[PDB]
Design a protein around this motif. Structure first.
Motif, short mmCIF file in Angstrom:
data_model
loop_
_atom_site.label_atom_id
_atom_site.label_comp_id
_atom_site.label_asym_id
_atom_site.label_seq_id
_atom_site.Cartn_x
_atom_site.Cartn_y
_atom_site.Cartn_z
N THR A 1 52.66 47.83 39.14
CA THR A 1 53.87 47.36 39.81
C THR A 1 54.92 46.89 38.81
O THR A 1 54.81 45.82 38.23
CB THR A 1 53.55 46.22 40.78
OG1 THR A 1 52.60 46.66 41.75
CG2 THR A 1 54.81 45.76 41.50
N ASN B 1 52.48 43.65 36.59
CA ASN B 1 51.36 42.79 36.96
C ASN B 1 50.21 42.85 35.97
O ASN B 1 49.31 42.01 36.00
CB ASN B 1 50.86 43.16 38.36
CG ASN B 1 50.27 44.56 38.41
OD1 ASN B 1 50.99 45.55 38.33
ND2 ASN B 1 48.95 44.64 38.54
N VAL C 1 52.09 41.01 48.97
CA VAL C 1 53.34 40.78 48.26
C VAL C 1 54.46 41.61 48.87
O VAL C 1 55.57 41.11 49.10
CB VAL C 1 53.21 41.10 46.76
CG1 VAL C 1 54.57 41.11 46.07
CG2 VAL C 1 52.27 40.11 46.08
N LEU D 1 56.26 34.29 46.28
CA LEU D 1 56.38 35.50 45.48
C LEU D 1 56.44 35.21 43.99
O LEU D 1 56.38 36.13 43.18
CB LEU D 1 57.61 36.29 45.90
CG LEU D 1 57.55 36.90 47.30
CD1 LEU D 1 58.86 37.60 47.64
CD2 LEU D 1 56.38 37.86 47.39
N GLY E 1 55.92 34.58 40.19
CA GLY E 1 54.97 35.23 39.31
C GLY E 1 55.01 36.73 39.49
O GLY E 1 55.69 37.23 40.38
N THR E 2 54.27 37.45 38.66
CA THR E 2 54.25 38.91 38.75
C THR E 2 52.92 39.39 39.31
O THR E 2 51.88 39.30 38.66
CB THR E 2 54.49 39.53 37.38
OG1 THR E 2 55.68 38.98 36.81
CG2 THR E 2 54.65 41.03 37.50
N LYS E 3 52.97 39.92 40.54
CA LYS E 3 51.76 40.34 41.24
C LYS E 3 51.91 41.75 41.80
O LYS E 3 53.02 42.20 42.08
CB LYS E 3 51.43 39.37 42.37
CG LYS E 3 51.23 37.93 41.92
CD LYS E 3 51.18 36.99 43.10
CE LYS E 3 51.16 35.53 42.66
NZ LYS E 3 49.96 35.21 41.84
N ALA E 4 50.78 42.45 41.94
CA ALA E 4 50.78 43.79 42.53
C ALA E 4 51.24 43.75 43.99
O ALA E 4 51.00 42.77 44.69
CB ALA E 4 49.40 44.41 42.42
N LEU E 5 51.89 44.82 44.43
CA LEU E 5 52.44 44.87 45.78
C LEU E 5 51.38 44.76 46.88
O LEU E 5 51.65 44.25 47.97
CB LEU E 5 53.24 46.16 45.98
CG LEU E 5 54.53 46.29 45.16
CD1 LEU E 5 55.35 47.47 45.65
CD2 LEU E 5 55.34 45.00 45.22
#
Ligand code: M9A
Ligand code: MG
Lengths: 527, 395
Positions: free
Chosen positions: A414, A435, B221, B250, B252-256
């Motif tokens: 992502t 991510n 997400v 939301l 931080g950086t997270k997978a969808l």
């Protein structure tokens, strides 16, 4: 004397608030004056004009070239308002076709009496020692604004009953001519032509060519039609007017002649490509080709080919190898576009032209797979349609180069992307974070916000696998990509397209900017 | 029986409009029809002294070809000549075609020249056949305005008999609203029709659609990003929408596809937003002077959404349209039927047609819309070439 059937005049008025034209008569030589006196004398003898007195204030200038030349331009400006050529490929083959051009057309139709007062002109006398000779028209003048309309209306009015009485013949009427045609025997046809001439003669219309007919730039032969030979001017210096004329001639040639390209020459009116283009045009104009006529009993077919660079060509035919006509389509001016849209537009054009010429929509042979069109129209945000068509395989084929996922991809990385730029210094930055920890920021000189957001997306595409999710805050970039261009004016967009083509699955998400949405960093590019 | 004088606007000349190409069958139909109308004095041939022209084509409501005239230019050029708001509140409304009466009234001799039209010829082989109207033409806005008194005198006994029925008139169409049952409604319509001889819509089943948010046990997400986008959009419409606590998730950086559990603040905020969306829109009024704007979006699979408003983010009405009749394979037919239905609803609610914004290229629409068009009137339209981001937000 057998009495001539009376022609009822058409009431004519000037424009509201305006009066009739008044213009001083121009000084003329003695020879001119004599010639005009004689001409007007015999015309008065025939009954086309009449002599008037001082009671008429209106004066129309006159010259002599003999032949009289009355200039009604002012009268035309003050006269009221009055109410497309037939295409050879639309004509239906007939065993016999006769042309009848009526002589003294406008001078055979009477003028409304209450308007004759405004067509008054004066012949200057010798040495100007005596009052000029006054005249007014009693019929439709040559060069008057309202002559052709009234003439053709009268013509139709007289032609109706004969046409009704003879369903076995077909009559066309352009301006001052009649084109009759039939599948009868030669004797019967010629006889009926004589009958028509008699019927026209009853109302006082005088009528007299044989194939091939030279008509409106066309050449009409019994079994076929073509265009009069095209002459491409040869000069080492090509001016703007020369290019306009060349474009006009090449466009005119493109109806019968397949493969005519005019993109470069028209682009120069806003190279080796242009020279090779015009040389290929001279290569096509080498051996002439003929178009056929239209047969209502057979299907109408239009086949389309992509010529490249926004150019399309089409052939309209009923039987293989025998074209009814041909043509081309240039793409509209735009920043982005794809082949499918241009194809759709081309189809629309051909359709309208067809309905004009044959009164029906032809079946289409298109270089696109049924599946491709299905996917396209089903997923395309705009409404779109094409009439009945089938797929012919003649590469290049129109295809969809990439397709965006409707849902986020599982197992796919992502990429949260972003770009920004300083307005005055034109300095910016563009990049991404993912991510899996993967990051990148690149600095850029001479750029804007849009360019940096596009650049950010492009970066995400470059450094990602076969499957990828992409998050952006740019409504602009999403707007461009949701239009699905396969080609663009901007090199960056083309590079992004080139990237998308290589991808297997791409999901493009959108979020609002500066909402504090995590992973979306406007703070990296603001420095 | 006597002609009422009709003029034009202060300084507007009569309509000159290009006749667009017609197929052969339509030309035939128009020739036959106009011959029959010429025999009955309804129209008469004219000469070149008439500069004015109005477009004309042929439709099918019934296998019999009907003649349709594009009186838009004439209507807007025609000089300016009491909406029953209880019509939209009725249980049922039935539309009738009372145009057949309009041809019994003679037209002012001075105005006929403006109603001139041309039957075109194929391949321009012959001049087109030009006619002018001698009686009141269908499609003209002046025709119902002139026949209004006669219509009143005709419909007087039926209105005095049972005043549970609302009666409105727009162009060639007569709208009849009631609260009865469909069978009794049809017998009443039969009795009204035979009452007019001697001389199926459900407005209560439409509404103004609310903005709904998803109800989920677990949020990804992507789910939350869409939610925040939608709420951010809704903030333009509603005063108290806030998304800071949802955006806080939301961070931080997270997978969808990763599931994010809602906090208490997020759930509270979401609920507050729901409560806000349950309310109507603040200060939404109808201005009879301004223009009605209808926007349509293609949702796919036969689904179409629409909004009628006057000012941005102030919807007078919103609706959906998924009706499928023989249109499955054709987008343009669908859009045409949709535009028709929306225009009809607009006629019922406000007594006038809106200006459309169609999600279609001009060329396509202009080429094909007359094939699927069954309506006696025509609206105005424009074309949106840029895809709206808000599509799924109305889905
Ligand atoms: N100068 C001249 C000009 C001459 C003729 C024109 C014209 O012939 C027709 C008139 C009426 C019915 C059919 C016609 O033609 C069909 C094709 N066709 C042509 C020539 C021939 O020899 N045979 C044959 O089959 C029709 C038209 F629209 C323009 C014409 C112009
Ligand atoms: Mg950004």
């Amino acid at each position: 004397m057998v009495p001539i059937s009376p022609i009822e005049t058409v009431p004519v008025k000037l424009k509201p608030g305006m009066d009739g034209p008044k213009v001083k008569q121009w000084p003329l030589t003695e020879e001119k004056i004599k010639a005009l006196v004689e001409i007007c004398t015999e015309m008065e003898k025939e009954g086309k004009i009449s002599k008037i007195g001082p009671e008429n204030p209106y004066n129309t200038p006159v010259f002599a070239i003999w032949r009289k030349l009355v200039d009604f331009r002012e009268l035309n400006k003050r006269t009221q308002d009055f109410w497309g050529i037939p295409h050879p490929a639309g004509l239906k083959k007939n065993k016999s076709v006769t042309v009848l051009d009526v002589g003294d057309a406008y001078f055979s139709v009477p003028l409304d009496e209450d308007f004759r007062k405004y067509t008054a002109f004066t012949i200057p006398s010798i040495n100007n020692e005596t009052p000029g000779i006054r005249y007014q028209y009693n019929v439709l003048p040559q060069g008057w604004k309202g002559s052709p309309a009234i003439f053709q209306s009268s013509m139709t009015k007289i032609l109706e009953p004969f046409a009704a009485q003879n369903p076995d013949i077909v009559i066309c009427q352009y301006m001052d001519d009649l084109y009759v045609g039939s599948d009868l025997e030669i004797g019967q046809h010629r006889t009926k032509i004589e009958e028509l001439r008699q019927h026209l003669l009853r109302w006082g219309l005088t009528t007299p060519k044989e194939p091939p007919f030279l008509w409106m730039g066309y050449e009409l032969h019994p079994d076929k039609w073509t265009v009069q030979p095209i002459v491409l001017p040869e000069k080492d210096s090509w001016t703007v007017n020369d290019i306009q004329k060349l474009v006009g001639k090449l466009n005119w040639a493109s109806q019968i002649y397949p493969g005519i390209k005019v993109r470069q020459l028209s682009k120069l009116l806003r190279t080796e490509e242009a020279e090779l283009e015009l040389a290929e045009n001279r290569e096509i104009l080498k051996e002439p080709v003929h178009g056929v006529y239209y047969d209502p009993s057979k299907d109408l077919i239009a086949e389309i080919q992509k010529q490249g660079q926004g150019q399309w060509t089409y052939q309209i035919y009923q039987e293989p190898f025998k074209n009814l006509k041909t043509g081309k389509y240039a793409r509209m001016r735009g920043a982005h576009t794809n082949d499918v849209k241009q194809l759709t537009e081309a189809v629309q054009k051909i359709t309208t032209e067809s309905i004009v010429i044959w009164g029906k929509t032809p079946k289409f042979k298109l270089p696109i797979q049924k599946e491709t069109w299905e996917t396209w129209w089903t997923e395309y945000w705009q409404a779109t349609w094409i009439p009945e068509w089938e797929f012919v395989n003649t590469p290049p084929l129109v295809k969809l180069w990439y397709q965006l996922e409707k849902e986020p991809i599982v197992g796919a990385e992502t990429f949260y992307v972003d770009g920004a730029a300083n307005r005055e210094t034109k300095l910016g930055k563009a990049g991404y974070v993912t991510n899996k920890g993967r990051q990148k920021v690149v600095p850029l000189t001479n750029t804007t916000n849009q360019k940096t957001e596009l650049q950010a997306i492009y970066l995400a595409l470059q450094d990602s696998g076969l499957e990828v999710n992409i998050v952006t805050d740019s409504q602009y970039a999403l707007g461009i990509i949701q239009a699905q261009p396969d080609k663009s004016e901007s090199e960056l967009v083309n590079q992004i397209i080139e990237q998308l083509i290589k991808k297997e699955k791409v999901y493009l998400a959108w979020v609002p900017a500066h909402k504090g949405i995590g992973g979306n960093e406007q703070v990296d590019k603001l420095v | 029986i006597e002609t009422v004088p009709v003029k034009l606007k202060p300084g507007m000349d009569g309509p000159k409009v290009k006749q667009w190409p017609l197929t052969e069958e339509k030309i035939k139909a128009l020739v036959e029809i106009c011959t029959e109308m010429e025999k009955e004095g309804k129209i008469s041939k004219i000469g070149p002294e008439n500069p004015y022209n109005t477009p004309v084509f042929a439709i099918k409501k019934s296998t019999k070809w009907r003649k349709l005239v594009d009186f838009r230019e004439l209507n807007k050029r025609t000089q300016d000549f009491p909406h029953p708001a209880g019509l939209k509140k009725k249980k049922s409304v039935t539309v009738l075609d009372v145009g057949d009466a309009y041809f019994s009234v003679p037209l002012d001799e001075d105005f006929r020249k403006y109603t001139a039209f041309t039957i075109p010829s194929i391949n321009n082989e012959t001049p087109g056949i030009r006619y002018q109207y001698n009686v009141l033409p269908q499609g003209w806005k002046g025709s119902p305005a002139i026949f209004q008194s006669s219509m009143t005198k005709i419909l007087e006994p039926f209105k005095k008999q049972n005043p549970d029925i609302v009666i409105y008139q727009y162009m060639d169409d007569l709208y009849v609203g009631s609260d009865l049952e469909i069978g009794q409604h049809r017998t009443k319509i039969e009795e009204l029709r035979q009452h007019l001889l001697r001389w199926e819509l459900h407005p209560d089943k439409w509404t103004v659609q609310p903005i709904v948010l998803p109800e989920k046990d677990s949020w990804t997400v992507n789910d939350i990003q869409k939610l925040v986008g939608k709420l951010n959009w809704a903030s333009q419409i509603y005063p108290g929408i806030k998304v800071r606590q949802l955006s806080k998730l939301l961070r931080g950086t997270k997978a969808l596809t990763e599931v994010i559990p809602l906090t208490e603040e997020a759930e509270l905020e979401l609920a507050e937003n729901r409560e806000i969306l349950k309310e109507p829109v603040h200060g939404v009024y109808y201005d009879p002077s301004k223009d009605l704007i209808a926007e349509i979006q293609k949702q796919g699979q036969g689904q179409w959404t629409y909004q009628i408003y006057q000012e941005p983010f102030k919807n007078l009405k919103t609706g959906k349209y998924a009706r499928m009749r023989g249109a499955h394979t054709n987008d343009v037919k669908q859009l045409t039927e949709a535009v028709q239905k929306i225009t009809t609803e607009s006629i019922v609610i406000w007594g006038k047609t809106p200006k459309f914004k169609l999600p279609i290229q001009k060329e396509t629409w202009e080429t094909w819309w007359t094939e699927y068009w069954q309506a006696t009137w025509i609206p105005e339209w424009e074309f949106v070439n840029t895809p709206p981001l808000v599509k799924l937000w109305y889905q």
